[PDB]
């Protein structure tokens, strides 16, 4: 029976491949060769954010493009103020090891995670004026990877047990379980419709999940090694991945196919974080080679390099309104680039 | 414009407060030395750390020679650790507690050590080797039923190193086999590593009263080499 199951699974797989081939026809590059290149985008450092103690893993821009929160191995959840380069708050975590950060779009809550299998929730606007633990969401086993706020009361969070849990801070219970990945999921991003997200595991695959019904609508494949960077396109019908094999793809949700590879031979180390800009001609991606660069998402061309970093780059976030981008590397530094 | 003025003043006040607190946290973060425990599934991690506590993650804090260390017993995770082991890059050293009696998993132990040394982000940090379960090894070598020569045919074509320092109450057979295990790890240790990070093996048992001293010595040597390289004295 197992042989028949494998045979029919292979039949379905090659049927999907044949459908993809039939729905390919023409490539994006051939039809997009008439677009003007972006060209070199010479970008300097504006104000450096030096307040962190150890390596920085995650940062998230706020909705107002004013204040943002970042991670550090010390156990700090510092929230910065972009224009004035100021510390608005400092949340000391119980667990020193943290790997994820999210800022609630309502502007009153900040999340965190880490090896402790606890996706701790903190509040900001409080009567006493001091931050505190709002709710200690628990239930995972594997290490926690990325978290984002669906709304003011629910968070979707990715762990290291190949299971993704959607929560409810008010009840502290796992509303839904997304068990469709084989390897550990690294990063998931929020589509503007706040009903869909894509989860990328260490099996070089990205599987699309829907928030409401909680099932894997579709999957995306084409990478060679583990992927640890993700972000939706602002329109919500595209998303680019950064793996460890120095390749960035671009899969479209509607067609379920790879579009193009963002790579060059001289790059030998993989991408860590990605962040789509507000328009599309700008595609940013960090690199292990002590620097971060920006790709042209429609012409497969590098446009400038945000050099000036020591150690590895691991986080990348452009403001919602597109004023600037903050890149944090392992040197406990955050830099603002226009 | 007065509202913007007072808002900016409030943010600057918050900054001075937070910077004072963060400098206070600076004074302690570097003081604590991070350590990491890795090894076989039954390798003696939790019970050794529990034993030395008297002097998910099963953390621990202890004070030796007026300097504080942090030992991590990561056990609340899966058996895949290709990815979260990168978080421990800025860690003073790695402890490698390995089974010494059960030779069946010794090959897996060799492979695990070889992977740790040659990793492309752990090459900066040194590795400390604990050959735990010495009483069991001594007891079971005396029986001789295991036939250690089976799992490694080159075990016989070997003699004790000239620099061997056995305890007077030991046995030539157990010591000869035991230094065989050490040397067969160190041939892996020397084969790669261009002076950036050093391996220091220490013969330790689960219940020992001087386990902390060996950790102190190893971390002292590792930080000494790193710091001398940091200057021009190399």
């Amino acid at each position, epitope marked *: 029976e197992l042989d028949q199951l494998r045979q029919e699974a292979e039949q379905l797989k090659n049927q999907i491949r044949d459908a993809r081939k039939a729905c390919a026809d023409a490539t994006l590059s051939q039809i997009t060769n008439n677009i003007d290149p972006v060209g070199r985008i010479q970008m300097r450092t504006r104000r450096t954010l030096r307040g962190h103690l150890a390596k920085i893993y995650a940062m998230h821009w706020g909705t107002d493009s004013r204040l943002l929160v970042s991670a550090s191995q010390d156990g700090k959840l510092i929230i910065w103020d972009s224009y004035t380069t100021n510390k608005v708050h400092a949340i000391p975590l119980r667990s020193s090891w943290v790997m994820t950060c999210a800022y609630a779009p309502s502007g009153n809550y900040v999340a965190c995670g880490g090896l402790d299998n606890i996706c701790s929730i903190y509040n900001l606007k409080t009567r006493e004026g001091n931050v505190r633990v709002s709710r200690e969401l628990a239930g995972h086993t594997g290490y926690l990877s990325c978290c984002r706020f669906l709304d003011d009361n629910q968070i979707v969070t990715s762990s290291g047990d190949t299971t993704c849990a959607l929560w409810d801070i008010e009840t502290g219970q796992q509303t839904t379980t997304f068990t469709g990945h084989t390897g550990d999921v690294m990063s998931l991003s929020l589509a503007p419709d706040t009903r869909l997200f894509v989860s990328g595991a260490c099996d070089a695959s990205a599987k699309l999940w829907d928030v409401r019904e909680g099932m894997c609508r579709q999957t995306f494949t084409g990478h060679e090694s583990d992927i640890n960077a993700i972000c939706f396109f602002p329109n919500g019908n595209a998303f680019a991945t950064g793996s460890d094999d120095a390749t960035c793809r671009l899969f479209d949700l509607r067609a379920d196919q790879e579009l193009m590879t963002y790579s060059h031979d001289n790059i030998i180390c993989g991408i860590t974080s990605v962040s789509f800009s507000k328009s599309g001609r700008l595609l940013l991606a960090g690199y292990d080679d002590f620097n971060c660069n920006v790709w042209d998402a429609l012409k497969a061309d590098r446009a400038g390099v945000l050099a000036g970093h020591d150690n590895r780059v691991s986080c990348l976030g452009v403001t919602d309104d597109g004023m600037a981008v903050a890149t944090g590397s392992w040197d406990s530094f955050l830099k603002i680039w226009n | 414009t007065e509202d913007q003025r007072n808002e900016e003043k409030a943010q600057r006040e918050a900054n001075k407060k937070i910077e004072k607190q963060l400098q206070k946290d600076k004074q302690v973060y570097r003081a604590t030395h991070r350590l990491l425990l890795l090894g076989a599934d039954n390798s003696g991690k939790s019970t050794i750390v529990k034993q030395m506590r008297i002097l998910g993650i099963f953390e621990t804090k202890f004070q030796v020679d007026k300097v504080n260390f942090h030992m991590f017993d990561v056990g609340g995770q899966r058996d895949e650790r290709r990815k979260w082991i990168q978080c421990f890059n800025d860690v003073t050293a790695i402890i490698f507690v390995v089974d010494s009696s059960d030779y069946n998993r010794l090959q*897996e132990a060799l492979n695990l050590f070889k992977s740790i040394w040659n990793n492309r982000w752990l090459r900066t940090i040194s590795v400390i080797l604990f050959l735990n379960k010495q009483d069991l090894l001594a007891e079971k070598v005396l029986a001789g039923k295991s036939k250690i020569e089976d799992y490694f*045919p080159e075990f016989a074509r070997y003699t004790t190193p000239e620099d061997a320092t056995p305890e007077p109450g030991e046995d030539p057979r157990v010591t000869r086999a035991k230094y065989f295990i050490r040397d067969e790890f160190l041939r892996i240790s020397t084969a790669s590593g261009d002076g950036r990070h050093y391996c220091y093996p220490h013969f330790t048992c689960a219940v020992d009263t001087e386990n902390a001293r060996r950790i102190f010595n190893d971390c002292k040597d590792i930080i000494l080499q790193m710091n001398l390289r940091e200057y021009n004295l190399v």
Partner: nanobody, 126 residues
Framework: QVQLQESGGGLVQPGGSLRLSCAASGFTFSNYKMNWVRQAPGKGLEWVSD????????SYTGSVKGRFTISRDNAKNTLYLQMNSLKPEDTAVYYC?????????????????????RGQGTQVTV
């Protein structure tokens, strides 16, 4: 998509020869470092032998030194493992493993849990 299919392997008495082939797809064969993993019945998972990018970095496990022979064909995306003079204990299942990261020498694929980049395996019985 990355696939690793193993070929060969049959019921052979102690002695004789067996040919084992790995069918590789979805990735670049040359740069990645590849190794084989064994699975003794009622026991855990282990490693067989590894070949680096150059092909001149052959190393052997302690169990087999002159008994085994590892080779690969980068042009045809095939990795080979030559058997001769088998023993009853080597009654494992042979998975075509591969270290994930390009251009490196480290991989943790001795995991018991289902690692992504290794095949369904072929049974060899002695």
């Amino acid at each position: 998509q990355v696939q690793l299919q193993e070929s060969g392997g049959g019921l052979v008495q102690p002695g004789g020869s067996l040919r084992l082939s790995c069918a590789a797809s979805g990735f670049t064969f040359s740069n990645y470092k590849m190794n084989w993993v064994r699975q003794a019945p009622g026991k855990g998972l282990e490693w067989v032998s590894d070949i680096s990018q150059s092909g001149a970095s052959i190393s052997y496990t302690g169990s087999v030194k002159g008994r085994f022979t590892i080779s690969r064909d980068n042009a045809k995306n095939t990795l080979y493992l030559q058997m001769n003079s088998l023993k009853p204990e080597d009654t494992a299942v042979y998975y075509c493993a591969r270290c994930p990261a390009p251009f490196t020498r480290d991989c943790f694929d001795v995991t018991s849990t289902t690692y992504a980049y290794r095949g369904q395996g072929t049974q060899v019985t002695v």
